[PDB]
Amino acid sequence: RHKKLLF
Amino acid sequence: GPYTFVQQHLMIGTDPRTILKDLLPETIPPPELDDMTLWQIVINILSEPPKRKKRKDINTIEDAVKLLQECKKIIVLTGAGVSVSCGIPDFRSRDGIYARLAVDFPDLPDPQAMFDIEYFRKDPRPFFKFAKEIYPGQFQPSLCHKFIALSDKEGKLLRNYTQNIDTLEQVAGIQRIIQCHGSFATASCLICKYKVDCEAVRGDIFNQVVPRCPRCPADEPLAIMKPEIVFFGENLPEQFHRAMKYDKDEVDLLIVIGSSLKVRPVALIPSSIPHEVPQILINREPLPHLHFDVELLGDCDVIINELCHRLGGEYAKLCCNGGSQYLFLPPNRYIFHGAEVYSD
Ligand SMILES: NC(=O)c1ccc[n+]([C@@H]2C[C@H](COP(=O)(O)OP(=O)(O)OC[C@H]3O[C@@H](n4cnc5c(N)ncnc54)[C@H](O)[C@@H]3O)[C@@H](O)[C@H]2O)c1
Ligand SMILES: C[C@H]1CN(C)c2ccc(-c3cccc(C(F)(F)F)c3)nc2N1C(=O)Nc1cccc(-c2cnco2)c1
Ligand SMILES: [Zn+2]
């Protein structure tokens, strides 16, 4: 799933 | 998979250079490279996802005003830069809030830790110090906000995806908005899920008192009222995924304003739409990890101001009032006032 992540 | 492909070749004793001779038809790899290193090169090449490339036929700011005129269904992706002129500091820029938080919060490692649920449970004070400074009800929206608002009123705005939680687009009049990271609209107890509106916790927030649940036992320490701000690790709202599903095949123009695009899945939006759709960047710094068609670099207000004057009509009625100073770097990059890449 597309979870809020710092990339 | 590419990975499996290489595995099978390793079981056979295949020379990687044999595969690389036609996978890199014009390039021979330097003599002093490991075999496995070469195989990793093979994996990366084969598993490289199809990317959008810059359109060669779209470059200039004149091209940009052309697109703004003829396009309906525009997606505008905004970030914190769009609100710094309103009086709301950045994360990326010089003298953010973190410089002042690290002063008396030695445990706070990065700005992103304010939106870390584990750190929050440990000590929610840095978050609520941030909340008081950025809390809705105290700031006037910028020229950009007004610009996006006018686009929506004209029926040209497909949607404005914002990473901002300042809720300034409500003030500006931007109705076709998605708040990708939530807002301060409600607040909920971590423990019992007792929900409450923004007002109920506002008093405590401006008094630097951590808003606590009035229903949970008073001795329970984690009974804190947390605003519906999406934290890292958590899911984005249902609206985001629902809107992107419809919008990805409807958009004919993407503008990115005031964002470093370092946070997923919002940062994937330029990668998620059709490759032919034109992409404009309006930002203080360039973003080399993406392929924008036109790069307008500087304070987004002075750039938008310039764009509006060129557009005339209702758009020119917005801006502060000739052109604006810029350094043009062919084919597609413009350096306006305020452009900067900060480091030390
Ligand atoms: N107002 C807000 O909602 C707000 C404020 C501060 C931090 N944040 C967090 C920041 C983070 C989202 O990343 P992002 O939105 O990219 O913030 P960011 O700090 O990572 O990036 C801001 C980008 O905008 C650029 N910029 C700054 N000022 C201007 C300007 N005046 N004109 C044009 N460009 C400018 C800046 O160079 C940078 O590339 C989320 O975690 C937010 O919660 C949000
Ligand atoms: C293993 C990674 C990091 N390591 C292992 C590397 C170490 C060295 C090199 C490299 C250095 C000099 C020349 C070359 C060359 F590819 F032979 F030209 C490769 N490349 C890579 N790597 C590459 O991925 N190189 C590479 C080289 C050429 C193309 C690609 C690529 C990746 N996706 C599309 O193309 C990737
Ligand atoms: Zn509770």
Numbering used by the authors:
A (entry chain B): 1 to 7
B (entry chain A): 183 to 503, 638 to 660
Article, verbatim:
To address this, we developed an engineered hSIRT1 (mini-hSIRT1) that is biochemically equivalent to the full-length enzyme with respect to basal catalytic activity and activation by STACs.
In the quaternary complex structure, the Ac-p53 peptide and carbaNAD bind to the active site cleft between the large and small lobes. Ac-p53 adopts an extended conformation, similar to the backbone-mediated β-strand like interactions observed in many Sirtuin/Ac-peptide complexes. The main chain amide groups of Ac-p53 form hydrogen bonds with those of the residues Gly415 and Glu416 from the small lobe and those of the residues Lys444 and Arg446 from the large lobe. The acetyl group is sandwiched between His363 and Phe297, with the ɛ-N of the acetyl-lysine hydrogen bonded with the carbonyl oxygen of Val412, which maintains the orientation and the extended conformation of the acetyl-lysine side chain. CarbaNAD also makes multipoint contacts with hSIRT1, most of which are similar to those observed in reported Sirtuin/NAD+ strucutres. Similar to SIRT3, binding of substrates or the active-site inhibitor leads to domain closure, bringing the small and large lobes together. Comparison of the three structures shows that the locations of the N-terminal SBD domain relative to the catalytic core are divergent among the three structures, likely to be impacted by different crystal packings. (2) How does the STAC binding in the N-terminal SBD enhance the substrate binding at the active site, which is not obvious from the comparison of current structures of Mini-SIRT1/1 and Mini-SIRT1/1/ p53 7-mer/CarbaNAD?
